[PDB]
């Protein structure tokens, strides 16, 4: 049942076995039931750790491929190993995106849930964009922006700049403009406005809100 | 080829994908050739991360069930989950122990090679002992330590890192498994004191690091 899979997923998180944690929360969503405020956090933390290992491995192997130019063997090995990580990375994102489109986004009856899943949809399309080679990158980048844009319009309309979902969405959206679209100016504009509007509204969950605001100012300092 | 498997193993270590790293070194061991000083380190680091991820997961799940005395439902799930990690942990060690007794320890040529694979045997039996067959695994673990301790004591210097590393893992075996916190402190202190009385540029780091861990084990045990 649901409570059995959720409790086992909480055990897999403590044991740091996120592949077991992901399969448990995937089954909870595949039952057609709208997730609670805790079940969607477990599903997110699960696949983010699963997808993060491939991303971290992809960056290292890709850096080696760029650095091993001149030695075709050391560079082709890195190329082929990277391509295998890419296939693992693509299957994970397609698993989450198909999970978001079939069960999560349609059943979302609250704007809080809808912005969360839409931001999550823009993220895993952005993770596919970091790896795309061509022909399909144009659409993947567009599909990532559309999910981000719809999430940004709902959040800015029905959430406050102190809400952690809106701040985190502005953080990931600005990263999308900077690293994917190569627009380092709208990235700073998105991050600075969301950071200043959060202070101006300031002018429980505030621990997450303060952390994201520090991440916004840090991205601004790095991009400058 | 041997070069491709090792090169990918070095590459899998950088990507932190030790399941692929262990599978490559297992294929190098399956080819029967005696592993070089670099290959035996890559094989060890590979399976140490693979077998250590299940050890860390096992310590967490069992510690959670100790506080679940009130609820019998959660106690079953934690018990069932712990047993699945135990089955994973058993299959990993038996995989290493099979390679040790079939390809590795048999073809052990030079002395330094014979001592390293002999230490690795007692370790993965010690990992099995951490989880009737108990005394059978514990004694099977002890003989590999003693056999390697005699060889390293007779033909190696107390400054060699393989001799110092074996003394460290042997001392841990007495404390955690045999519950002998005192017969091990002598072994750790003798191997430490026999080295301070006395080494190459390619060996100080591994040698001096183990001695630091030796005195750190002695301090921890003597609370």
């Amino acid at each position: 049942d649901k409570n059995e899979l959720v409790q086992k997923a909480k055990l897999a998180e403590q044991a740091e076995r996120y592949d077991d944690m992901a399969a448990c929360m995937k089954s909870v969503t595949e039952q057609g039931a709208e997730l609670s405020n805790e079940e969607r956090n477990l599903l997110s933390v699960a696949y983010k750790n699963v997808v993060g290992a491939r991303r971290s491995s992809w960056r290292v192997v890709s850096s080696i491929e760029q650095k091993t130019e001149g030695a075709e063997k050391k560079q082709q090995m890195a190329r082929e190993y990277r391509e295998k990580i890419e296939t693992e990375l693509r299957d994970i994102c397609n698993d989450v995106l198909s999970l978001l489109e079939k069960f999560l986004i349609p059943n979302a009856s609250q704007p809080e849930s809808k912005v969360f899943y839409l931001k999550m949809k823009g993220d895993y399309y952005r993770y596919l964009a970091e790896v795309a080679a061509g022909d399909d990158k144009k659409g993947i980048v567009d599909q990532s922006q559309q999910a981000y844009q719809e999430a940004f319009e709902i959040s800015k309309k029905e959430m406050q700049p102190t809400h952690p979902i809106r701040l985190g969405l502005a953080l990931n959206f600005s990263v999308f403009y900077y690293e994917i679209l190569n627009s380092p100016e709208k990235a700073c504009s998105l991050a600075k406005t969301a950071f200043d509007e959060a202070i101006a509204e300031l002018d429980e969950s505030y621990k997450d809100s303060t952390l994201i605001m520090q991440l916004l100012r840090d991205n601004l300092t790095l991009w400058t | 080829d041997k070069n491709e498997l090792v090169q990918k193993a070095k590459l899998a270590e950088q990507a932190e994908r030790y399941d692929d790293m262990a599978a490559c070194m297992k294929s190098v061991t399956e080819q029967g050739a005696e592993l070089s000083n670099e290959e035996r380190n890559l094989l060890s680091v590979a399976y140490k991360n693979v077998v250590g991820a299940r050890r860390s997961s096992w310590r967490v799940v069992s510690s959670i069930e100790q506080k679940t005395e009130g609820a019998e439902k959660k106690q079953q799930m934690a018990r069932e989950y712990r047993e699945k990690i135990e089955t994973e942990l058993r299959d990993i060690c038996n995989d290493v122990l099979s390679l040790l007794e079939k390809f590795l320890i048999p073809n052990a040529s030079q002395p330094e090679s014979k001592v390293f694979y002999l230490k690795m045997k007692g370790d993965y039996y010690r990992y099995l002992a951490e989880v009737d067959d108990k005394k059978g695994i514990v004694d099977q673990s002890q003989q590999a330590y003693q056999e390697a301790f005699e060889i390293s004591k007779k033909e190696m210097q107390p400054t060699h890192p393989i001799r110092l590393g074996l003394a460290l893992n042997f001392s841990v075996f007495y404390y955690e498994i045999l519950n002998s916190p005192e017969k091990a402190c002598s072994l750790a202190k003798t191997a430490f004191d026999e080295a301070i009385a006395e080494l190459s540029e390619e060996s100080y780091k591994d040698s001096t690091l183990i001695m630091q861990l030796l005195r750190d084990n002695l301090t921890l045990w003597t609370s």
Binding site: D123, V175, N219 | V172
Partner: peptide
């Protein structure tokens, strides 16, 4: 640099 998004006995 990357952009930001949202006791025991020792052995050898």
């Amino acid at each position: 640099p990357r952009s930001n998004s949202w006791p025991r006995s020792n052995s050898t």
